[PDB]
Scaffold this active site. Structure first.
Site, mmCIF file in Angstrom:
data_model
loop_
_atom_site.group_PDB
_atom_site.id
_atom_site.type_symbol
_atom_site.label_atom_id
_atom_site.label_comp_id
_atom_site.label_asym_id
_atom_site.label_seq_id
_atom_site.Cartn_x
_atom_site.Cartn_y
_atom_site.Cartn_z
ATOM 1 N N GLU A 192 0.866 -1.211 0.000
ATOM 2 C CA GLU A 192 0.000 0.000 0.000
ATOM 3 C C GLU A 192 0.893 1.249 0.000
ATOM 4 O O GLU A 192 0.579 2.170 -0.740
ATOM 5 C CB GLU A 192 -0.942 -0.026 1.202
ATOM 6 C CG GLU A 192 -2.060 -1.033 1.084
ATOM 7 C CD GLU A 192 -3.111 -0.738 0.028
ATOM 8 O OE1 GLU A 192 -3.097 0.364 -0.484
ATOM 9 O OE2 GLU A 192 -3.917 -1.641 -0.291
ATOM 10 N N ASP A 204 -6.238 8.469 -0.399
ATOM 11 C CA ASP A 204 -5.743 7.428 0.529
ATOM 12 C C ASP A 204 -4.535 7.965 1.313
ATOM 13 O O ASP A 204 -3.663 8.601 0.727
ATOM 14 C CB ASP A 204 -5.343 6.185 -0.276
ATOM 15 C CG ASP A 204 -6.469 5.606 -1.125
ATOM 16 O OD1 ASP A 204 -7.626 5.658 -0.702
ATOM 17 O OD2 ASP A 204 -6.171 5.073 -2.172
ATOM 18 N N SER A 217 -11.470 11.257 -3.876
ATOM 19 C CA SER A 217 -11.014 10.807 -2.543
ATOM 20 C C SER A 217 -9.480 10.701 -2.535
ATOM 21 O O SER A 217 -8.851 10.733 -3.595
ATOM 22 C CB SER A 217 -11.682 9.533 -2.094
ATOM 23 O OG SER A 217 -11.276 8.415 -2.876
ATOM 24 N N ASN A 243 -8.970 5.540 3.211
ATOM 25 C CA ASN A 243 -9.633 6.373 2.180
ATOM 26 C C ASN A 243 -10.485 7.475 2.843
ATOM 27 O O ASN A 243 -11.146 7.220 3.895
ATOM 28 C CB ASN A 243 -10.414 5.466 1.229
ATOM 29 C CG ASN A 243 -11.020 6.257 0.094
ATOM 30 O OD1 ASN A 243 -12.188 6.628 0.169
ATOM 31 N ND2 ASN A 243 -10.213 6.596 -0.901
ATOM 32 N N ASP A 297 -12.390 9.410 -7.975
ATOM 33 C CA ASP A 297 -13.652 9.888 -7.344
ATOM 34 C C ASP A 297 -13.395 11.161 -6.519
ATOM 35 O O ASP A 297 -14.350 11.633 -5.897
ATOM 36 C CB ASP A 297 -14.321 8.795 -6.494
ATOM 37 C CG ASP A 297 -13.501 8.250 -5.329
ATOM 38 O OD1 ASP A 297 -12.432 8.791 -5.048
ATOM 39 O OD2 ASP A 297 -13.946 7.290 -4.704
ATOM 40 N N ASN A 304 -7.528 9.441 -5.742
ATOM 41 C CA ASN A 304 -8.379 8.518 -6.546
ATOM 42 C C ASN A 304 -9.168 9.333 -7.580
ATOM 43 O O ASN A 304 -9.257 10.558 -7.435
ATOM 44 C CB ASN A 304 -9.264 7.691 -5.613
ATOM 45 C CG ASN A 304 -8.407 6.958 -4.599
ATOM 46 O OD1 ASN A 304 -7.518 6.218 -4.985
ATOM 47 N ND2 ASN A 304 -8.603 7.218 -3.319
#
Ligand SMILES: [Cl-]
Ligand SMILES: [Cl-]
EC number: 3.2.1.17
Length: 129
Positions: free
Chosen positions: A35, A52, A50, A59, A48, A46
């Site tokens: 990750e 991380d 969002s 998220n 959308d 991301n």
């Protein structure tokens, strides 16, 4: 902070991740490797809108507030910035809530694709735990 493999294993063990909801410590170390490359300051945007955050790439749509993800549920009740600390406590507490929510560690794309069904014990081999 960029963790060493065995350093992170030991931090994760102290915080109660070893066998938390049936996931051995190797699973958590493998998820963090793929990750974030063990980097507490890792961020990734991301499509959308969002983002991380941190060692476990949690998220901003569901888990933390970053003030720029419209309709964040902020289920861990924490600013996303708190997840980028050298102290992994906030990341661990929030991960425990995520892995409880239904789908287990499948919530982590890198775990599903790079860790699930592999010899995850290899990630804690050679560590004094
Ligand atoms: Cl393991
Ligand atoms: Cl599960």
């Amino acid at each position: 902070k960029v963790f060493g493999r065995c350093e992170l294993a030991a931090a994760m063990k102290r915080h109660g991740l070893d066998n938390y909801r049936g996931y051995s410590l190797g699973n958590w170390v493998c998820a963090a490797k793929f990750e974030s490359n063990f980097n507490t300051q890792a961020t990734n945007r991301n499509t959308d809108g969002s983002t991380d955050y941190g060692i476990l790439q949690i998220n901003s749509r569901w888990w933390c507030n970053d003030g720029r993800t419209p309709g964040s549920r902020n289920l861990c009740n924490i600013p996303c910035s708190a997840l980028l600390s050298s102290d992994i406590t906030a990341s661990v507490n929030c991960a425990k809530k995520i892995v409880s929510d239904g789908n287990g560690m499948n919530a982590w794309v890198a775990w599903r694709n790079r860790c699930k069904g592999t010899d995850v014990q290899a990630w804690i081999r050679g560590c004094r735990l």
